[PDB]
Amino acid sequence: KGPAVGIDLGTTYSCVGVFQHGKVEIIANDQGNRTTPSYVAFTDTERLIGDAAKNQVAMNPTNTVFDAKRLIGRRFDDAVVQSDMKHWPFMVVNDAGRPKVQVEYKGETKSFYPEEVSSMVLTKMKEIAEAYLGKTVTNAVVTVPAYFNDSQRQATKDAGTIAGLNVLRIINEPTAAAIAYGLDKKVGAERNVLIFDLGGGTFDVSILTIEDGIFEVKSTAGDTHLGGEDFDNRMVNHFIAEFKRKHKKDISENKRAVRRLRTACERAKRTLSSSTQASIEIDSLYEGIDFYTSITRARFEELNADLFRGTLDPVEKALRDAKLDKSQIHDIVLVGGSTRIPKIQKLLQDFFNGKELNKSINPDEAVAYGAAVQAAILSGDK
User: Fold this and answer.
1) 130 belongs to the catalytic site
2) Which residues are reported to carry the modification N6-acetyllysine?
3) What are the angstrom distances between the C-alpha of 85 and each of 119, 171, 203?
4) How far apart are CA 255 and CA 244, in angstroms?
């Protein structure tokens, strides 16, 4: 046969891992990136997936598709679909009740179901793993949010099937995160687990009670439209204002300039998680004007103070809906890159009155890690 893989098919980014020789290896893509944008793009000559698709988004916005995870398993008339369509530069059309993304591709109008778009992302993840392993990869466990219904689950499975993957099982993202930390294998009775998942575009809080290998979902809360990208946007707005004051130019409607500034801001955010300052270095940001400056960790925290504090309300709501006190939480699990932000960890740890956080597994990789473990179990190789 071949190696079984765990795939986190994320809203904004995806990640693939493999369990072998007693260890999970998270697999780097051809750019050396351990996560891959959940982006597909269509041009005059080719279809682009992942990094290559995201890299040309400002030059080809209406034919660059993302957020298929917000469409998958839903109907066109869905209130969620109608709302979300407003914020996408690509077209969504109705095919006999079902949403389809419509693009131009090689001088032709083509349309794709959300699960076809996700199949393309899954194809890239498959090829990434095959490039690393030197072997054909067919079996996989693919993750979804706990709140996904059977239509969403089936459509996610269907995306894998279209990609040529044998989907062994669709498992919940918070379950995968808990499996990564071996929280179902502790010597004891019930364990109440809080998963704090602050992703690129979504914030999910999940409370699980694990006992006898059952991962009971007690509560879910969060914000479907809050993620690391919001914190990046506060930085983007900050520097747009700065460039206006410095140079009397509003760069807002130059898509390329704004995209480049955003990329710089994403990088600065990562750097600010392990350093107290970050350099912004952009050659010819606008009209040949260089933008070289810096931002301190304190200023980044100040720009996002409301959004950071605000993450605690879903935690309180999850607790209330699960009928549990703060002190009844056995384990706290960090998932999503934004959970590396020192201020967020401090906020969450203070909220739990000094309780230690499970954060040793790269939070951006924890879900694919648990998926890879489960994949090994299901294929019979753990």
Assistant:
1) no
2) 106, 244, 317, 326
3) 21, 27, 20
4) 16
Q: How far apart are CA 286 and CA 207, in angstroms?
A: 47
Distance from CA of residue 294 to its chain's centroid?
27
DSSP string, 253-317: T-HHHHHHHHHHHHHHHHHTTTSSEEEEEEEEEETTEEEEEEEEHHHHHHHTHHHHHHTHHHHHH
Instruction: Identify whether 135 is a catalytic site residue.
Output: no
Cα 222 from chain centre: 14
At position 43, the amino acid (one-letter code) is T
Does 8 qualify as catalytic in the annotation? Answer: yes
- The contacts of residue 361 (CB under 8 Å, 6+ apart) are 180, 181, 369
| Angstrom distance (rounded) from CA 178 to CA 211 | 12
Q: Which candidate in 8, 115, 158, 331 is catalytic? A: 8
- What is the distance between the alpha carbons of residues 67 and 84, in angstroms, rounded to a whole number? 9
DSSP bridge partners of 197 = 204, 335
Residues written for the chain: 382
Give yes or no for a contact between 269 and 296, defined as CB atoms under 8 angstroms apart: no
Residues placed in the known binding site for ATP? 10-13, 69, 200-202, 266-273, 337-340
Which one is catalytic: 54, 69, 126, 157? 69
**Distance between CA atoms of residues 378 and 296, nearest Å:** 46
86 class by beta-carbon count within 10 Å (0-12 exposed, 13-18 middle, 19+ buried): exposed
Please answer whether residues 13 and 37 qualify as being in contact, where contact means their C-beta atoms are separated by less than 8 angstroms.
yes
Resolution of the structure in the document, Å = 1.9
- Distance in angstroms (rounded) separating the CA atoms of residues 309 and 212: 35
67, 115, 158, 173: the active-site residue: 173
Measured CA to CA, the distance from residue 18 to residue 166 in angstroms comes to: 15
Domains contained in the chain, CATH given: 1-65+121-185+359-379 (3.30.420.40), 66-120 (3.30.30.30), 186-226+311-358 (3.30.420.40), 227-310 (3.90.640.10)
Phi, psi of 145 (to 5 degrees): -60, 150
